[PDB]
Amino acid sequence: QRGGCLQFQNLMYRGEYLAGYAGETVNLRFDPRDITTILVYRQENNQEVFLTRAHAQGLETEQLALDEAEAASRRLRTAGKTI
Amino acid sequence: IEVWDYEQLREEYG
């Protein structure tokens, strides 16, 4: 997105080079045990290459499994609060 | 302690 953001499971990520690629599609590669950091890959000459590591803004020192982020998101949507 | 009327603050303003 604009300003290098990615959105994934409700978390918003930014990283060291992403803003230069705004509008492109990247393959996020992630670990379901801890989604606070994601590896971002892109395709060049039909060859996938590594781009950068993207970190969920403001929670870089925490940890979250994908199941915790998904279950908490349902509680927020049920409660009617913003995410 | 002092409390202000929001319209007195308007009347006192520049």
Binding site: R14 | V3, E7, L9
Partner: protein, 257 residues
């Protein structure tokens, strides 16, 4: 008519010296003397605009015979989908100049001139997230070029908007957060409304445990609900002739929330 005078008074508004207003003014004086740009954030009923009007209405414009006014602090509030011209139009009008038809660069040049002419030290932008994304280029420019502390006021959506532009995010990084009342602080504040705001002929004892349960569940700690619940209960109970607020009549107002 003594009733009708109280109904005309109570539907009005006041500013109370509270800790969360005294804190903001000590902080904004720091940013104004140091010329550092920053943001004030927090949930929508914490009273951030009253805390900023209490700042604008202190630090009054100074008048010198036939000069343009010296204006230490400017507070503006943008309309929805505010464009570069609309920001410049409002800053120009607030310093008391009429804005004549022109291209965006005529409004830019005239705005820079009146900000530097009126000696502005701080510019406060309320509801900052009404700004269109490109206008922040002109807000960054005002703050880079002139010695002006820009203050953005908003809620948690403003951060969701600031974080979409690296240039804004790394400039507006210093921040104060407006929070909710609790414990002794909510308890002490209820007494300040009873004795400084409501002016009912006998004590309603709103800080008592049987009454704080009602008020806690109603207000959630928001100063903007506390003033609203207690004005509505005072208006209503006087139109029935009581000299107080009591358990059942307050539970009638709170059952609307």
């Amino acid at each position: 008519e003594w009733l009708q005078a109280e109904i005309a008074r109570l539907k009005g508004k006041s500013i109370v010296p509270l800790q969360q207003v005294k804190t903001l003014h000590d902080w904004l004086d720091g940013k104004r003397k140091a010329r550092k740009s920053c943001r004030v954030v927090g949930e929508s009923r914490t009273g951030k605009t009253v805390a900023c009007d209490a700042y604008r209405y202190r630090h009054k414009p100074q008048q010198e015979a036939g000069r343009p006014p010296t204006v230490p602090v400017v507070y503006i509030r943008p309309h929805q989908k505010c464009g570069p011209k609309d920001l410049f139009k409002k800053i120009t009008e607030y310093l008391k100049y009429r804005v004549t038809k022109g291209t965006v660069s005529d409004f830019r040049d005239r705005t820079i001139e009146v900000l530097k002419g009126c000696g502005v030290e701080m510019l406060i932008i309320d509801e900052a997230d009404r700004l269109k994304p490109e206008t922040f280029a002109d807000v960054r420019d005002i703050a880079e070029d002139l010695g002006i502390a820009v203050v953005l006021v908003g809620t948690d959506r403003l951060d969701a908007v600031i974080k979409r532009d690296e240039q804004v995010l790394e400039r507006f990084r210093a921040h104060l957060r407006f929070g909710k009342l609790s414990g002794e602080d909510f308890k002490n504040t209820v007494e300040m409304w009873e004795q400084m705001v409501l002016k009912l002929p006998v004590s309603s004892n709103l800080k008592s445990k049987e009454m704080l349960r009602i008020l806690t569940s109603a207000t959630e700690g928001y100063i903007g609900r506390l003033d609203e619940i207690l004005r509505e209960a005072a208006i209503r109970s006087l139109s029935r002739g009581l000299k107080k607020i009591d358990k059942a009549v307050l539970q009638e107002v709170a059952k609307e929330y």
